[PDB]
Design an enzyme around this catalytic site. Structure first.
Site, short mmCIF file in Angstrom:
data_model
loop_
_atom_site.label_atom_id
_atom_site.label_comp_id
_atom_site.label_asym_id
_atom_site.label_seq_id
_atom_site.Cartn_x
_atom_site.Cartn_y
_atom_site.Cartn_z
N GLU A 149 -4.04 -9.04 -0.45
CA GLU A 149 -5.42 -9.02 0.04
C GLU A 149 -6.37 -8.75 -1.11
O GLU A 149 -7.51 -9.24 -1.12
CB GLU A 149 -5.57 -7.96 1.14
N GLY A 200 -1.51 -5.17 0.83
CA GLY A 200 -2.81 -4.88 0.24
C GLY A 200 -2.98 -5.57 -1.10
O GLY A 200 -4.10 -5.91 -1.49
N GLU A 239 3.80 -6.45 6.19
CA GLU A 239 3.33 -5.48 7.18
C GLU A 239 4.03 -5.62 8.53
O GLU A 239 4.36 -4.62 9.17
CB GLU A 239 1.82 -5.58 7.38
N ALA A 250 0.85 -1.19 0.00
CA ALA A 250 0.00 0.00 0.00
C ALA A 250 0.88 1.24 0.00
O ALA A 250 2.11 1.14 0.03
CB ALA A 250 -0.89 -0.01 1.23
#
Lengths: 255, 257, 257, 255, 255, 255
Positions: free
Chosen positions: D109, D106, D129, D63
């Protein structure tokens, strides 16, 4: 059947526990007959509502203790007697309990298994199991708790005290209370009225309410709308709405 | 001419949405539901709007839904339409919502009121689900929200008969928070709304989520969620001010951060 | 003697835990909660203690939590502290627990009472969750237990306003089991506890577990759990004695096995 | 749109992340555009299948860190940025992820949000992350754990290590792995085939599978059969079964 | 502590089962000691990882056979010995099991209670209890099933056969398999690396993964994102992302 | 029965689907017979294991399509045909499916309803429902998804493609794969072994595994330990201990 009597009146099926000599104590044998009778009325397209009531002074005062007294965990595990009660739970036809008198232990659990309860002013509910060294085993602890909360449920379950029809009604356990002499008349009037509602709608609404008890809101609404959709495949939905828009009496047929 | 079926306005920190189709007692059409959703979400996004009030113009709050537009529907059309998706959107609005029920709140109308966090009803208001008498059933959460509020025994009685419930009884059952005189409806509501608008914004928001979880979640897990929101509140200035004022025996001064 | 915030004692088969910091209205500090849990768990494990009673010394049961010790805390400190894990320990105590609410039971105090199986309240007792007014929210199950007991509509009003509930109202809502005069509280409570201690111990235990599952579990699974406890009781002497003493029409003698 | 590019091909809608300058790092505005694009295709009944892929060498590598590097909990709470991901979760139209390269954080995901995943043998998955002092916040910890179990989930989530496309396929995360130059070819082929299946059946099967993930078996089956009933209100069910019985090729219409 | 031996090393807490004479048979007493030790290490913010292993040739060959011979239903009900096992289930600090040999029955259950499992080549797993007419009572039936499905789980639980370290790894039960003489050295190395990861990140990711095993997707993601928010209140998140952007090595402090 | 043949060999009940002329296509009547036979074997405390297999070249190749080609939603709703499948689901006696050939649609769902599956290396599994404009309606979407995950489940459910026995076993759906001519030999050997295990233990373990699939870990363990307790009320638990301390073969009597 040797412990119950069943009859039909219009689109309503009536089941009367017939062991007044022992206040209709629910024996494993009697429960078996009751389930067989309920399932039979359920399967019969002609019967749209089922009513359970007791012959004599009581609805059902507990279960047969004698046949239970000497049991052990293993015999009970193999017996799986509550499987008969689970069969009652999944019956899709509307069911009403007309509680004419004492409804204790299994008797209270039988009433709680119905969708609606119309109680005699003289009826009392309770779970004396604790005082016999045991506990309700046919959903008593579960259904009572979901209806009135754990604080109030534990007070009745831990004491085995008798609850009045009036208090049961205020707590949301009983739907209506009426004089002993008007019990059946009122119950049959209600049943007749329900037998006149769109059969599919009652069926699917009953399923939704049952999911509402367990299901998280979002998922319950998910199930609810699927039933909503299904109703639009029925002639009763078309007629019900057409009638509403045409200011005329609807003519349902259960399809 | 923003909307055609409703009228929205902002009074102080309170957003007000008035159903505007009294000629049909505010019957909830799919179009109207879409406008209500747009208005609510906008008020929700507006950092200046801390509370949202919903009420009906005329003598009814909303008397059912638009039957004509769905009288000839079939399962397939409804499945692709997915009309209740709009209702799910209302369900997830995090801003406090209050329903000021001024009269008849039936079917979709009752469901709209149930969708709110609190309900202030006029002693003249009536609630009910007449759907069964139309050959159908509530489809916007009615069977779910009523059962969770009053239990299956009582829920089935109302849902199977489609009978009308009085405001007084609705209050006794814990469905309606308070009942007041018809002329005092919007006053009692705007006052309550104004009082809530003065509460710590973050706290109201997080308490609402927790309560919603308490309805679905098992105790232990609901408590695990609850405490996470509790921790989060200590990252706000309002928590610091609230506890200080408490200890300093003075009235707190919240700001919303 | 390593209990500086509470006082525990035993009378017959009843264990009594009295919050002992009346100088600060028995404010629930992390230290006090830890002491309550230690004493309750000890009483729970002691098979000679069939019932536990919680009450407060002085005018209050527990008037909230220790706010000064909480005032400057931050999210991270709270996360590592994991103070609510102690409350979870109270949640799983198998011995019957009764709260004798002698007075103010606010915030954590209300959550402590709610953690008990039955609540006997003084007519002078007041309940509430003032947390919202401090910029926070209940963090020890308050939002969860209250909602399960009175529904989301009513729970949200108390939680969002932080208003105080009377003992009378709490009884009406099904939160409090009985209300008695201030000078009769302990007499009534000890009387009730004594009675419960005479009930078949295994039955009270398994019935309590079944009820807890009923709050969370879907009906079918809850019933599956219920009957397993039903089966187990038939391996106890009390079941054989209880039913024999019923068919023979005599007084049963229970021993807890 | 400013960070993505959408186009249609047959009954297939294509959404290409268009910010290769930053390896298609997912910013909040980018997610918002992806959602808008997906919902549009979802609503467009001309698009029966949606394909997601990234322009350049990467699908999406993480992200926008710069964007959230200084955020606090209160900022994130009011922002409720994951509400956009929830919106992707409820899209009913079939979705396929064509992973061309790095799919991290992200990005991973985003792929997991799709119904099926086809990946280049050169693609890599992972959740770095943990190494930035945080954790996956858009369903990563949830979807990964449900697919491979907690033991293996923690291994990847706690280390932030990169998983090869081949490993993902063996774990049941990725449906198929193909050579880099055939990624879109294979994905578009699959998309076409699926676009030829009865739309209602795909739609209702997808819902059931989602319930199978979250529902206890008995209730999941309850939902499953209701969807089953609903399909018999469609012309595709009649035609599908007729063609089967008539041993001929069916002609579906999505109704 | 007369059944186990606990000690620290770096930021890693080590617990060694110490009843090799009886292959570390898990007795109620031993489990009580294991809980005390683990909870002490858990509360200590200096111990970032906990490792469990057994002395001798086995991890834990099962539960204390003497207990199994003396216990009865009622006695077991009052003992509530499995409450101690529940305490292990909620430990928030990362836990690693270094299976040095046989891990049968309770032994297997203990290993399953950890977040990751590093097994010796000679390690074997299984639930032979069924052969003694008993079943697992410490989560064995639950954890095994969630990891490998009911079909496979039932075969192992019903037969009581032993599973090799290799197969366990294939099934996603065991994370890594190494030679018997490198077990501890390899486990402490892994524990050491994990100890260097942002403490809060590891803690909240573990919580999220645990929710993913039980929670429906939407609710799980709801929990997940709250933990996501919380991490932005820590210095480690700011230090981690800033360092990532500044192109520097982050210095995490567990705050 | 007209569509099946039931047989009892020792403590093993055998049910042979007998409509090879139609590849054992499962009609509603046939399902009803299977349920009747299965429940009969279940109640017979002399039958400890139930085996299902198909006569001819297929196990069961789909459902009776002609029978439902013209059905509508209302007809299906009142029929509630899947209630028969729910009855299969709750049978407590161990069940094994011996898949000799094609096991498609209802056929695949029937195999999945069993506790264990032994398949011919030539057998194939699949859900062609989608290609008929419908979907699996007897648990297929639910059981398959719980076994292999949503990514892989959708792949098969959306395409209707046939899965090989080999792959099914790799996925954890099938327990054992053997030579076509050895199918029943292997199945009966497995059945014979299970028949020698403690009946109560197999019974209570099965229940626990079923909870593990749905229930959250903590609650599943609370259920598990209750079954653990009950077994100590059995004589077989004593026999199991005795046979062990005496290093001999135990003779369990299901008590």
């Amino acid at each position: 059947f040797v412990s119950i009597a069943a009859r039909q009146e219009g689109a309503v099926g009536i089941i009367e526990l017939a062991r007044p000599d022992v206040l209709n104590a629910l024996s494993r044998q009697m429960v078996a007959e009751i389930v067989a009778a309920v399932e039979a009325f359920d399967r019969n397209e002609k019967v749209r509502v089922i009513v359970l009531t007791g012959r004599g002074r009581a609805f059902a005062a507990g279960a047969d203790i004698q046949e239970m007294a000497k049991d052990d965990p293993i015999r009970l595990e193999w017996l799986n007697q509550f499987a008969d009660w689970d069969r009652l739970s999944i019956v899709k036809t509307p069911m009403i309990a007309a509680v004419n008198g004492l409804a204790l232990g299994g008797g209270f659990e039988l009433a709680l298994s119905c969708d609606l309860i119309v109680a005699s002013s003289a009826a009392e509910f309770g779970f004396p199991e604790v005082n016999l060294g045991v506990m309700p085993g046919a959903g008593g602890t579960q259904r009572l708790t979901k209806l009135i909360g754990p604080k109030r449920a534990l007070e009745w379950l831990w004491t085995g005290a008798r609850m009045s029809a009036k208090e049961a009604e205020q707590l949301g356990i009983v739907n209506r209370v009426v004089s002993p002499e008007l019990l059946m008349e009122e119950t049959m009037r209600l049943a007749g009225r329900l037998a006149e509602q769109p059969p599919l709608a009652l069926r699917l609404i009953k399923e939704a309410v049952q999911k509402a008890v367990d299901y998280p809101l979002y998922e319950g609404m998910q199930f609810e709308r699927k039933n909503f959709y299904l109703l639009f495949a029925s002639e009763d939905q078309k007629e019900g709405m057409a009638a509403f828009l045409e200011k005329r009496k609807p003519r349902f047929q259960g399809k």
